Amino acid sequence: AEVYNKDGNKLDLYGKVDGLHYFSDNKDVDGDQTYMRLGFKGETQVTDQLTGYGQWEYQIQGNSAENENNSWTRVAFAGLKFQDVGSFDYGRNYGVVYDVTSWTDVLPEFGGDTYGSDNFMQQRGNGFATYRNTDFFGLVDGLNFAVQYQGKNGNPSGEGFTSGVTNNGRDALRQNGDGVGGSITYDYEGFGIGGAISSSKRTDAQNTAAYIGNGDRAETYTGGLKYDANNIYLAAQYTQTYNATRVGSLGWANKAQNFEAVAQYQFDFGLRPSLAYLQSKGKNLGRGYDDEDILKYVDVGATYYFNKNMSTYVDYKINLLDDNQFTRDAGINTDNIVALGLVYQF
Numbered sequence: 064a065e066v067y068n069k070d071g072n073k074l075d076l077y078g079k080v081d082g083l084h085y086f087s088d089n090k091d092v093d094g095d096q097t098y099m100r101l102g103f104k105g106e107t108q109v110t111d112q113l114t115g116y117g118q119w120e121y122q123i124q125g126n127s128a129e130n131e132n133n134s135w136t137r138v139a140f141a142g143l144k145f146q147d148v149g150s151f152d153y154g155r156n157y158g159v160v161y162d163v164t165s166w167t168d169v170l171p172e173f174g175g176d177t178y179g180s181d182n183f184m185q186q187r188g189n190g191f192a193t194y195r196n197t198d199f200f201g202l203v204d205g206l207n208f209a210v211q212y213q214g215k216n217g218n219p220s221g222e223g224f225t226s227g228v229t230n231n232g233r234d235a236l237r238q239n240g241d242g243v244g245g246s247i248t249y250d251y252e253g254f255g256i257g258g259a260i261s262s263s264k265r266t267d268a269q270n271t272a273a274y275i276g277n278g279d280r281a282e283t284y285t286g287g288l289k290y291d292a293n294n295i296y297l298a299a300q301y302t303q304t305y306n307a308t309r310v311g312s313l314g315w316a317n318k319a320q321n322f323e324a325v326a327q328y329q330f331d332f333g334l335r336p337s338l339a340y341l342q343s344k345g346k347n348l349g350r351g352y353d354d355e356d357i358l359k360y361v362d363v364g365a366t367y368y369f370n371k372n373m374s375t376y377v378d379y380k381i382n383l384l385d386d387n388q389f390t391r392d393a394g395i396n397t398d399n400i401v402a403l404g405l406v407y408q409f
Contacts, residue, residue: 064409071108078102079408080125083172089398096402097125100137112146137187147201149194156191158184159211162246163257163287166298167323170339171364172378172402177321177343181237183213183281183307184244184261189231190214205250213242218268227266235274236309239281240264253292259285265306274314275349278306281315296327308343310357311393316345319357336365337378352389359383364402372409378402 067074078101087093102120109115118140124133142152157165160178164185168175178185195209216239218224219232232238242263249256263281270277287300300323308319325339343358364378384390384397 073106075104076102077104077409079406081404081406083402083404086401086403087398089396089400092396092398092400095126099123099125102137109143114144114146115142116144116152117141140191142193147198149196151192151194153190153192155187155189156193157187158191158213158261159193159209159244159246160185160259160261160283160285160302162207162209162248163259163285164300164302164323166255166257166287166289167300167325167339169296169298169325169327170337170362170378171366171376172404173360173362173364173380173400174323174325174339174341177302177308177323177341177358179309181216181233181239182309183239183263183283184211184242185283185307188213188239189216206247207249208245208247210245211243213239213244213263215240215264215266217266227268235266235268235271236312236314238266238269240266242281244283248287250289253290255287255289255291255298257285257287257289259283261307263307269315275310275352276306276315276317278315278317281305281307283307294329294331296329297325299324308345308357310345310348311390311395313393316343316357317347317349319346320344321358333368334365335368336363338363355389356384357393357395373407375405376403378404 064076066076080099083096085092085096100122104118106114106116120137122135122137127133138155140152140154140156142150144150180187190213192212197207198204199206215229217227217229217232220228220230240263244261246259261283265278265281282305285302290297302321304319306315308316310316321343323341327337329335339362341360345357346354360383361381366374366376368374380400382397382399386397390397
């Protein structure tokens with residue numbers, strides 16, 4: 064909702080409450096999953112060509128008792144945009160690989176989980192410096208590219224570490240050395256085609272015997288396709304990764320091949336059914352694991368839109384992973400899940 068628009072400054076205050084419940088034989092995901100998100104997007108006109116902006120988004124879980132608080136910052140960044148040249152922003156933001164993979168992250172509840180948060184340059188993460196050029200100086204409609212740098216996020220401070228520390232340090236599964244990446248997308252009418260590449264130094268804390276997938280750098284290569292017209296949405300992405308994909312709590316995959324596909328239709332009366340397939344196939348994993356499925360599921364669901372502010376959905380994760388030693392060791396969910404959600408948003 065735009066709550067302020069005066070003398071060239073605009074402020075949009077937005078959010079949602081998702082009354083949400085999971086049904087699953089897996090009791091670690093089963094039960095109340097209610098949550099809310101809040102955010103703001105602000106923009107200020109500096110000149111006719113130059114605009115400054117900032118965005119912040121926060122998630123607060125609504126499913127805990129009052130003696131605890133489970134909340135986090137999704138994004139927080141400030142930036143400058145110049146008409147027909149580009150933009151730059153810095154902060155917690157999305158990695159440029161997400162420019163392509165976001166195209167299949169459109170499912171009612173699940174999806175978008177061949178990668179995670181704080182996972183090199185694949186999704187949300189800290190310390191992104193992002194440069195973007197839209198429409199190639201305004202001379203090629205629909206063609207966009209981006210180049211991104213990520214600074215090191217290392218070991219926690221004040222915990223007795225003698226190397227690799229940063230002020231905002233964290234556990235090794237969520238660390239990263241310096242990284243660089245890029246994306247190109249082209250959209251003509253309904254069609255879209257895109258590609259992205261990322262390369263991040265891996266830290267010493269990540270390259271210990273306690274984690275599978277030791278390596279100097281984490282690399283990702285992504286291609287994507289999209290069709291979005293005539294009430295039909297189709298998209299697919301394929302990603303090859305090296306020492307970049309987490310294998311639950313075990314560490315990372317030496318190599319992984321990720322694939323996601325989605326098909327959706329929008330009825331006039333407000334119903335939007337969705338069908339999707341995701342898989343992540345790991346190779347040469349180490350410790351005798353060899354080749355294993357990290358993720359494999361079919362997602363069938365539907366959303367009903369009452370209007371732009373109220374909707375309800377059901378999403379059914381038909382989980383094709385089988386319960387074995389590998390998935391047990393990594394703590395990967397192999398059970399089906401049904402989600403039922405009712406969402407108010409502004």
